[PDB]
Design an enzyme around this catalytic site. Structure first.
Site, PDB file in Angstrom:
ATOM      1  N   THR A 213       0.827  -1.237   0.000  1.00 24.10           N
ATOM      2  CA  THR A 213       0.000   0.000   0.000  1.00 24.10           C
ATOM      3  C   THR A 213       0.841   1.258   0.000  1.00 24.10           C
ATOM      4  OG1 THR A 213      -1.635  -1.202   1.252  1.00 24.10           O
ATOM      5  CG2 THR A 213      -2.018   1.114   1.205  1.00 24.10           C
TER       6      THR A 213
ATOM      7  N   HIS B  25      -2.536  -2.564  -5.443  1.00 20.22           N
ATOM      8  CA  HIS B  25      -1.693  -3.687  -5.892  1.00 20.22           C
ATOM      9  C   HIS B  25      -2.585  -4.888  -5.959  1.00 20.22           C
ATOM     10  CE1 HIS B  25      -2.178  -4.850  -1.725  1.00 20.22           C
ATOM     11  NE2 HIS B  25      -1.845  -3.597  -1.431  1.00 20.22           N
TER      12      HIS B  25
HETATM   13 MG   LIG Z   1      -2.988  -2.531   0.155  1.00 16.86          MG
END
Ligand SMILES: [Mg+2]
Length: 420
Positions: free
Chosen positions: A82, A257
């Protein structure tokens, strides 16, 4: 030292892809609202379970006449997951090849977008329903010039609002409204969602969606928490339209992602109606959605190949700010000259021509394996160089020795993120 900047600066200028005047400055003056869509992959867009759409709001945006949607946009993250994607949004520089850039490089000198935008009077804030120490955000944001950090201290962390990493998206978005509406305008803001996190369980009855039936409960439950994420974005958008910020803003949303790794290949082949997931198919599954709704600007469904590092210059260009003087790895997606050979952090890459995975080449269009003999090496070299220039900047903390023209140096000690 100062002389190592020279080589990197000469290459950044020798590749700069100039702005499309159809788009450049067309969103000048507007707020920016980023939304990080946790673990959300592009295959989910338009996907259905039992004839029911998994992400119906995101689908409408994908199909509307006004929102830019990019269906060949790839995450370029490594182990910082993240926060690797956040680093790229703010810097247009690649994260570390191993470990987390947020954790290890928070003392680097940075020249971020929120910091660039200060000279245009932007107040910047992050919203996130978890403690500020997570991923070392409270240290790194200071380096990035983020003025405000609305972490979990500003949300009601009770029984029914909390799941695993903190706030659920629905109440997180509700509670963020008065905080967001208190921001002096123009503002640049980041919303980091939490709910669509591995292993993807959601509590009954926080959503009504069926689980898929693919023989793997991680993959089965993905679709339920994705559906929940989609309702949360819908509510956020409805509320942005009540308070009038929707027309005053550029909303930019991205999957951070992949959510589903290669440990779930057996079930993912069923999801896709395939016999097996190959290396090639897995590379294709690294598409994450990117949406940009810039108010006052007619968006397009763009098919150009692009990665995380391309977002920041796209946005800056939309706001009328010239990025030629910054050391940024990415290329404005709306630019005519926009490069489409997209590096991955590990040195693999994808382009309209080739997908390269662990040294094998495939035809991007067909998946057909190519022998080394018939491959033009020029793309691979472009990739190595793109990654190398970024790595010189990060490893040698080179921005201590570079002054862009507008820019006034960030002082990390200015920022304080204690709730009073
Ligand atoms: Mg993430």
């Amino acid at each position: 030292d100062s002389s190592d900047v020279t080589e990197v600066e000469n290459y950044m200028k020798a590749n700069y892809d100039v702005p499309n005047n159809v788009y450049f400055g067309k969103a000048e003056g507007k707020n920016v609202i980023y939304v990080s869509l946790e673990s959300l992959q592009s295959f989910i867009i338009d996907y259905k379970i039992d004839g029911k759409e998994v992400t119906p709001f995101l689908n409408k945006l994908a199909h509307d006449n006004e929102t830019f949607y990019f269906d060949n946009f790839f995450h370029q993250t490594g182990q910082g997951k993240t926060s690797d994607a956040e680093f790229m949004m703010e810097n247009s520089l690649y994260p570390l090849a191993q470990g987390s850039v947020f954790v290890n490089k928070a003392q680097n000198t940075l020249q971020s977008v929120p910091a660039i935008l200060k000279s245009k009077n932007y107040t910047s804030a992050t919203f996130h329903g978890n403690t500020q120490t997570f991923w070392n955000r409270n240290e790194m944001y200071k380096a990035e010039g983020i003025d405000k950090f609305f972490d979990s201290a500003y949300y009601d962390m009770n029984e029914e609002n909390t799941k695993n990493y903190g706030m659920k998206d629905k109440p997180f978005f509700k509670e963020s409204m008065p905080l967001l509406e208190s921001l002096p305008q123009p503002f640049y803001t980041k919303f980091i969602t939490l709910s669509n996190h591995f292993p993807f369980g959601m509590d009954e009855g926080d959503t009504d969606f069926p689980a898929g039936d693919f023989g793997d409960s991680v993959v089965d439950n993905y679709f339920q928490s994705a559906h929940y994420l989609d309702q949360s974005i819908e509510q956020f958008f409805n509320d942005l339209k009540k308070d009038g910020l929707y027309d005053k803003s550029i909303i930019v949303m991205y999957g951070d992602h992949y959510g589903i790794s290669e440990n779930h290949n057996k079930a993912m082949a069923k999801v896709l109606g395939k016999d097996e997931i190959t290396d090639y198919d897995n590379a294709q599954l690294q598409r994450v959605p990117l949406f940009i709704h810039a108010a006052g600007v007619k968006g397009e469904k763009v098919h150009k190949y692009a990665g995380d590092v391309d977002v920041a210059p796209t946005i800056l260009h939309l706001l009328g700010v010239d990025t030629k003087d910054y050391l940024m790895s990415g290329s404005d997606i709306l630019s005519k000259e926009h490069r489409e050979v997209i590096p991955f952090r590990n040195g693999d890459f994808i382009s309209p021509k080739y997908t390269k995975i662990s040294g094998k080449y495939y035809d991007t269009k067909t998946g057909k394996e190519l022998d080394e003999s018939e491959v033009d090496k020029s793309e691979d070299s472009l990739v190595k160089k793109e990654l190398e220039m970024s790595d010189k900047i990060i490893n040698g903390d080179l921005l201590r020795f570079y002054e862009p023209k507008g820019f006034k140096k960030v002082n990390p000690s200015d920022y304080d993120y204690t709730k009073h």
